[PDB]
Amino acid sequence: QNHTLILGWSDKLGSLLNQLAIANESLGGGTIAVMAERDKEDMELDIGKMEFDFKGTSVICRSGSPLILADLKKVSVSKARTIIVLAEDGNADQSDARALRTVLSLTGVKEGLRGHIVVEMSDLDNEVLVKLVGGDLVETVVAHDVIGRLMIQCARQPGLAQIWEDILGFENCEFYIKRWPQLDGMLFEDVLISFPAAIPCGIKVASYGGKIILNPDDSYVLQEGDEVLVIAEDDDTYAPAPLPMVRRGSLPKDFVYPKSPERILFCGWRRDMEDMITVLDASLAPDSELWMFNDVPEKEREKKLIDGGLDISRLENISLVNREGNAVIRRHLESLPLESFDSILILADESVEDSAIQADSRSLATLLLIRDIQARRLPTVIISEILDPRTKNLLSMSKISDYVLSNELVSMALAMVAEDRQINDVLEELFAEEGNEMHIRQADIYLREGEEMSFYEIMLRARQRREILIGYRLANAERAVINPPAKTGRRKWSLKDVFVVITEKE
Amino acid sequence: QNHTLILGWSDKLGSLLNQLAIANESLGGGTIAVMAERDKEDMELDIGKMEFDFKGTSVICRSGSPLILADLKKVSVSKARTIIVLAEDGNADQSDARALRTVLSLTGVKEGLRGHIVVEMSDLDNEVLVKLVGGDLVETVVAHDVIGRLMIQCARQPGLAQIWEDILGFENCEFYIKRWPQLDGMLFEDVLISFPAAIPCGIKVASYGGKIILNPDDSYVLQEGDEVLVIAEDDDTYAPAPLPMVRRGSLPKDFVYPKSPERILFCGWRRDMEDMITVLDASLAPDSELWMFNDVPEKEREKKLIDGGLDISRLENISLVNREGNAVIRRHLESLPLESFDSILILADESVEDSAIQADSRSLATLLLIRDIQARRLPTVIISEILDPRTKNLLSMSKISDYVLSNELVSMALAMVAEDRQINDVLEELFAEEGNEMHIRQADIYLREGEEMSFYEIMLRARQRREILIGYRLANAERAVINPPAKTGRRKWSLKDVFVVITEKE
Amino acid sequence: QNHTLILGWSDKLGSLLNQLAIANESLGGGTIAVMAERDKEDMELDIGKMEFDFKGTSVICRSGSPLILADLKKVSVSKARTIIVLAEDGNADQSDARALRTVLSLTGVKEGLRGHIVVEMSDLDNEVLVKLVGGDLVETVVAHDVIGRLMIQCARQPGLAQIWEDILGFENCEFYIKRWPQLDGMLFEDVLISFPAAIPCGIKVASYGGKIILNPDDSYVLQEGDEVLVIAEDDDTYAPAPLPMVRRGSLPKDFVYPKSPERILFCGWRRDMEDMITVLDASLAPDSELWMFNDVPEKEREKKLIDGGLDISRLENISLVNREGNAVIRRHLESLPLESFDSILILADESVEDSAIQADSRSLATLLLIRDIQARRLPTVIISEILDPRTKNLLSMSKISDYVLSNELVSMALAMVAEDRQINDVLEELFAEEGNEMHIRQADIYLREGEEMSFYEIMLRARQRREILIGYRLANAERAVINPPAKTGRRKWSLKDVFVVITEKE
Amino acid sequence: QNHTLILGWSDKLGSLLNQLAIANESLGGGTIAVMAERDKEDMELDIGKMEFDFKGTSVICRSGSPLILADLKKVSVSKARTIIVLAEDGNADQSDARALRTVLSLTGVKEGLRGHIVVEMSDLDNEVLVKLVGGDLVETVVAHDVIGRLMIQCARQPGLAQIWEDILGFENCEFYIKRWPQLDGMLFEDVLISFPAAIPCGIKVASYGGKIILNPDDSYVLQEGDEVLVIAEDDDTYAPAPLPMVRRGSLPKDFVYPKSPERILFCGWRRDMEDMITVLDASLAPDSELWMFNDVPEKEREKKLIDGGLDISRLENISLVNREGNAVIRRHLESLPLESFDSILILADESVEDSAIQADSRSLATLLLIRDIQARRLPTVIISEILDPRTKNLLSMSKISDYVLSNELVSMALAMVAEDRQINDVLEELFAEEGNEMHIRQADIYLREGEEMSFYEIMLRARQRREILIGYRLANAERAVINPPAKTGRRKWSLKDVFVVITEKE
Ligand SMILES: [Ca+2]
Ligand SMILES: [Ca+2]
Ligand SMILES: [Ca+2]
Ligand SMILES: [Ca+2]
Ligand SMILES: [Ca+2]
Ligand SMILES: [Ca+2]
Ligand SMILES: [Ca+2]
Ligand SMILES: [Ca+2]
Ligand SMILES: [Ca+2]
Ligand SMILES: [Ca+2]
Ligand SMILES: [Ca+2]
Ligand SMILES: [Ca+2]
Ligand SMILES: [K+]
Ligand SMILES: [K+]
Ligand SMILES: [K+]
Ligand SMILES: [K+]
Ligand SMILES: [Mg+2]
Ligand SMILES: [Mg+2]
Ligand SMILES: [Mg+2]
Ligand SMILES: [Mg+2]
Ligand code: NA
Ligand code: NA
Ligand code: NA
Ligand code: NA
């Protein structure tokens, strides 16, 4: 039957369904079963009111418990190509306790499973046990952790918020892995320029057990069994073609400039915030500063951080500045040097995160106050965490929408891992401090003002500094273009254009 | 379809429906749609039990969410002449979070809206964001704030409670704005005396963008496009007539007396009480005193007030006296100099206001205790905030009813703004410290004992001190008369009669 | 229609219905309507499972709100002979807030009411306001207060618990008031001995406005309009008969002995416990002691007592001894001088009384522990408050049942006041410190060992010390006999017999 | 009708039904009635989804209250052979309050009861009152207390966890009591070897009132009326046969070695944990140590222990070491000398035990952390309490399953006591510090390496040290064998085999 089975119901369900319908469109639609401990008629009424085009995919609703075999058989658990275990809204520990029981129940199905299980986890500290019992069947996506990592990357490089929104999920272009036997024996540097409608980003190496290698060496020779990872518009829109001849050349300014220290403000004590501090410390230049403004008394912060595993005496690049106050009170915020921050993250505070409507209400209040304080004393990059995807969609035609990053990104990640489990490893690397990550790079590294050249020609220059070029954003365009059309056509570039690459760090 | 759409359900719904039915009576009835996340049959049963005459208006109930387009279309959202977003009973922040999402949902309706949106807000600090996202579509009525402002005005001038109850809502007389081309070129001083059945209070000035000017200069010449604001019995009961000839004269005692300091007691720590203190400080004579009796420790009060934006070192007219205790405990209240207060406001305390039945129970207890303490030590104007309109109506044949001001006034304000959005600006000015407000004035300013004259004759005397005369209360009448009949008829007035005017301050 | 209407639903409803069915049996049954905000079919199912004989009374159930006129008319509110407003189980203030709204709703019925309203109040401090708004329509029965007063009387005189249980409610004998014109002109001393099947206890005096005078002077001459209060088996079982001739005589030991001091223990901090302390102080001999064992810190007790209106420096007869601890912890109870108490009251503590099952569980635990501590250190009168009548009935064949006084007594009081509102004044006096009360008296006051005489003969001796004799308990009988049969028959009495009288104090 | 009646619904119901179906299988099935205050159709749907073979037993569901006679008659309460009163999940005191009311209701059934009542109690301190009111009808099983006692025995002797799981409940072998007249006059030492398919463990002695004597003297002569207690596979699988001739001999190493001190860690403050400390102190060798790691401040622990009746100055064998911290925080656990503990019990903490899913989630976290801390610092017997039987079953194919003891054992105990009430006394003795208990004993006490002999021959050697031999575990077997087949067959034993006996202590 090879349908997608979703176990549970949450605020993320509608956007997850949408993503799966987009992914299935190239098939002419598929089948999604949703099983939840709710009345079947209510579920059907709610699905019937969703406002997105199902694109030929049909959704079936059943009432039942994922711990009850009789209920799992109502939805053909053992024939599904993927099973997605949705987190419950609310308390992260309760949700993760249910996730663990569900995974145990699924691993107990005696007929076995055809597909893999994608588990939406809410707290990183609960992941090890779920992975331990789920073995080779389970992929975990730790939603809270992912969102923190994305907020940091977008704080560091603002234009990335639009790029990540484009790449995640199934609108526009995303990652695909597929076997191309006619490419065996090719060097990766030729594979790179072999697909008119795609960009190769890495290789699934068969002699490594199927391990995905992002940004491999140009001299890697594809072996029998290897597959190519690409960015492409859909699973069936791209294929290799005879090699174009691409003019070669040199980089004009292949330099590394000393990265400048950054000053970042975290508003709110986010659950597990030490995990963000660790990521930040491994991402910023030395002598950077992290300001934490929140209502936890300073005396007690060190205890919270050390119990979550952070040694604040071994931080390498950031110093911590603590300030105490209420992020919705004007008078407390105005004592901050707001104008001095390179970026400000407004985080859902651990004391209210169990109610998305209350957390989101506070984050939006804080946003407005910060803007107004600054405006009123004037004779900045702000990112706000939003927990309910419906509130993000509701904001979409508001200016405020530029200042928000939502759990819709979690639904997009869940759908990608549901469609190909190995994409979890790709996104894990790109979200991690180690290994490859996305960067927006000035044009004067790659070309001189007005130089007439093709996307492929820039791509080969970018390989001299060990980057995979995936797109660009022209000087006065509002959106970057990922996986551009007509990669052999030439144009005159500007030093105000910028390029999007996959690269290792310094 | 041009019906009124009400989104939500609350303790105020019945009185709002009543007001809209009164407003619609002159049409022979209209249509009200009510959509709420409740069972349709329950809604219909509850509506069917309301005890007021629907006067030809028909009410339709639908079950649905205002965030769900499919549900908004069930009630013809885009054809309604007005949409009213009712606050949820309970916690003000939760209610305002829902109001914001609803406004975003409504502004997303792609067919657009024919009418405006009236949003019942529960907390002033949440208003800016709703106004920001609702743009030109939204009028906000901040219920909590309005009630505080009305309680202060009635504490300052007790007879105003009956006048405001009369003017608000659609029983008796209220404000109407309408275009009268045959009055172009007239001076406002002639317009004032041109309507046998109405009193002009201001002009919508077309050269100002449609801005409403209350109490304009007598020499203002009405221009093409201007409209007249009046107090009248209904939208269709009044029209201009040939000018009466009105005898002119002088004021006998056009004096200003030094306003005397007042001593006011606030019982309870009302949410956002600094907003009332600000209003009070701009309303009382110098060397006045505000006593605050409530259970918040004195040490901590200053912090609450400064965080809500009140600088208590810049108060101009009042000194603050703090007393700590429980307003339902006899022994604590009896240490207050109760007999010395010009007025006492019993306020719904922020610690219980999320339960109207609990708040109202405490306010009534405090009322009884204050009366009894004073009576028992005897060998005063009290105003009590009541949150459930049903409790006010239940009290109506009790003596206690003179001591109460309720959220029914909010339903009356919501209906007025629903019927003409520009009435929000009129009421905002009259509730504000700035600009015009209502005053009850002694007769010896305007006339001598037994002087025989008409209402219009007094009105023109009142214009010499830049007042609009809207009514009077005779010496032994229990009710003031607003917009009196037969304004040209003469009678003999008494120095114990009083007059109701719209005026600027000192 | 002259039915009983009960508004609400509670743990007391079944026992109230039972009492009304008993009261109605002599009519051949009546009608009770019950209206509650519950599903009608559930109500009917619950009524159908009650285990007591309805004795020809029919019960009708309707679903509705007592605040909604349409609902009050479903149950013929204006034709009922009585309306009983049942308290809600749980928090006393919430229940009393609902009682007040209900009374206002009932006083608003424009057709008026045929009968009176009996209001079950939960907190004495809320009674004044309900009485103020209910005027002449309302009788209040303050359940919590009544139970405290009964527990004290039974602690002082243990045999009274059985007597009060007999007299309250409609099993056995109770109070009736009725007009007997053929008795006009009789002296009260002859009226006393005029009813073979009843005992006159007082007169409703028409020249006093219908005021009930308990235990009037023997020389009072019944005037036209007066009615007689009696204890009798039912409203129709008694009538006056020609005067018997009763031998007169003297009292052998008409003495007053010095009342001995008592030591009483209160376990638990009962809500409003200062009201019990006041009653106790006016009831005990001088140099008595009240021990209060409970978890409130001693420092804070004085504040609680003074805020409830008790001045502990003006106590006349008792000294207060405070001990702090947990009444369910053996080790804390064993530090008390348990063997020294004349009586011990186990009270439902204010911290758990909102859950009757939790309060009753603690009171029974404490009971068991006190018994066991004493038994285990041995090489006492205990009274335990029980809040759910079902738990009292469940205990009935247990020995523990002698140690319990329950809210069933409240249902019995409510039914008595429902049947004749003037019985509220009778019970108020008998429960009050002032005026008449019930006493169990040794036989040697009235007679010598083996003296052969009739009940009437003892009754006339008792009048020489201004007592109304209502019954007796023979030397080895387990139950007292109230309103005995055959009052003229003689028997030989024992100095170990005891007599039950109504009397004023010392 | 002689069915089993179960009153209530809980997380234990499915496993209790399973056990009763196993017990009934030898009859061809029986009848179980389940009555709960739930909708009948929901109950039936849930029963219909249980995954275990009902083996011919039929289950009937009814909706009703055990306090309501009409409801008790729907399920033929007075004809049931047993009534089981299931605890409610959640708060132990609430559950026990309901148990007490139910027992009173059952003892009030005027037709009487045919069978006994088994009451699942949640707190030991509540047991006395239930036993007091239930008299001879009631058997109590205090679930919390039993589980603590089993965890201690399994900590002391790890192989016992598998043995107890085998013996409890009705899979494999369990206890049966039955009268065998043909054995009157036999010595108990011959009775011991008289049943090919059973092992006699004791005698119900008729001259003692039916008291069960475990491990009686070999010289006891069975008298008329006595019955034999055995371990056997089912009630009908065993019978006596002519005496086998068993070779006699001596024990080679009938020694007692000095028991070595043990170091035990308790993680979590379990409700009533003083009851476990008492058991532990009477079970361990002198100079043993009990470490308690939990979040209760050390200052306050002594108060908790003394109020629960533990005098820590009279402990005979253990010293207490207190450590404060959070058992789910790695950094706190790693300060413990984890490698030094003979066993570690992870206990459901009293602060979360009212939610089984939250308690079990913490216990599993702690388990994982302890393992990982030890593994990571390496250049142990752990027992974890699990409150929901479904979580134990879900863990069953996980390695983690060796580290868990669950409330399924309570369902097994309830079913055993339901089937024969006298088994409660047998298990009470075996769980108690006093009297007989189970022990795993080295082979070199009983035999020499390679000695060829039968199970009966070892059994008679074991009687010389006053042990009843019930089974063995061979050197490389994963499971012990209880009540072995073919007890007269010989084999060659190894010094690495071990024997399971019932014995008194030192
Ligand atoms: Ca696709
Ligand atoms: Ca965590
Ligand atoms: Ca795509
Ligand atoms: Ca109108
Ligand atoms: Ca506010
Ligand atoms: Ca009107
Ligand atoms: Ca009667
Ligand atoms: Ca009180
Ligand atoms: Ca009677
Ligand atoms: Ca069997
Ligand atoms: Ca306990
Ligand atoms: Ca078995
Ligand atoms: K994409
Ligand atoms: K009006
Ligand atoms: K009676
Ligand atoms: K077994
Ligand atoms: Mg962590
Ligand atoms: Mg403010
Ligand atoms: Mg009081
Ligand atoms: Mg104990
Ligand atoms: Na990376
Ligand atoms: Na104003
Ligand atoms: Na009295
Ligand atoms: Na034992």
Residue numbers in the entry:
A (entry chain A), B (entry chain A), C (entry chain A), D (entry chain A): 320 to 698, 727 to 853
Please quote the authors directly.
Two DMI1 homologs, named POLLUX and CASTOR, were identified in L. japonicus and both of them are required to initiate symbiosis. To address these fundamental issues that define the primary function of these channels and their role in the symbiotic process, we performed functional characterization of the LjCASTOR channel and demonstrate that it functions as a Ca2+-regulated Ca2+ channel rather than as a K+ channel as previously proposed. We also determined the high-resolution crystal structure of the ligand-binding soluble domain of LjCASTOR and reveal that the entire soluble domain consists of two tandem RCK domains that assemble into a tetrameric gating ring where Ca2+ can bind and regulate the channel. Our high-resolution structure reveals multiple Ca2+-binding sites in the RCK gating ring and provides structural insights into Ca2+-regulated gating of CASTOR.
The Na+ site is not Na+ specific as the structure determined by using crystals grown in the presence of KCl instead of NaCl demonstrated that K+ could also bind. Interestingly, K+ binding triggers some local structural changes, most notably the flip of the backbone carbonyl of L487, resulting in two additional oxygen ligands for K+ from the backbone carbonyls of I486 and L487. The K+ position is also slightly shifted from the Na+ site, resulting in longer ion–ligand distances in the range of 2.6–3.0 Å. It is intriguing to note that Na+ and K+ can modulate the open probability of the channel.
